[PDB]
C-alpha cells in the first residue's frame, strides 16, 4: 500500500537550487520552460529538518 502527498507551494523570490553555473533549474515540460527544484535537495532538506532529529540516523561519509 502506497501513499501520495502532493503540494502546491508559491514561493517568494528565491534561489533554492542552482546548477554549476548558478542558474535555477529548468525543465521543458509541455513545450515551455518550467522552473524546477531538484528532488535530491528536497530529500536532503527533509532529512536535515528540525523534526527528523529523533529519526535522523544515517551517515554518508568517506571519513
Amino acid at each position: 500500500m502506497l501513499i501520495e502527498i502532493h503540494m502546491i507551494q508559491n514561493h517568494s523570490p528565491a534561489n533554492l537550487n542552482r546548477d554549476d553555473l548558478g542558474a535555477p533549474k529548468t525543465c521543458y515540460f509541455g513545450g515551455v520552460l518550467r522552473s524546477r527544484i531538484s528532488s535530491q535537495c528536497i530529500k536532503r532538506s527533509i532529512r536535515t529538518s528540525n523534526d527528523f532529529k529523533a529519526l535522523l540516523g544515517g551517515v554518508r561519509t568517506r571519513r
Partner: protein, 63 residues
C-alpha cells in the same frame, strides 16, 4: 530547502495538500500542461488550484 535562504528568506508554506490512497499513483503535472496565466480576479494559487481540481474531476470520473 536550505539554498540561498540567508539571502532570500523564502520560508513560505505549502498552500495545498492532496493525500490520496490507491495502488496506482498520479502526479498532477498534466493539470498544468496548459500554463496557468492569471486573470484580474483571483490569484496564481487559486487558478492553479482550479486547474488542479478540474484535472482531479476528469481523473475521478473519466479515470
Amino acid at each position: 530547502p536550505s539554498g540561498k535562504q540567508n539571502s532570500f528568506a523564502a520560508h513560505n508554506y505549502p498552500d495545498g495538500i492532496l493525500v490520496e490512497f490507491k495502488n496506482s499513483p498520479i502526479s498532477y503535472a498534466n493539470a498544468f500542461v496548459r500554463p496557468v496565466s492569471v486573470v484580474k480576479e483571483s490569484d496564481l494559487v487559486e487558478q492553479s488550484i482550479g486547474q488542479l481540481s478540474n484535472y482531479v474531476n476528469d481523473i475521478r470520473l473519466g479515470y
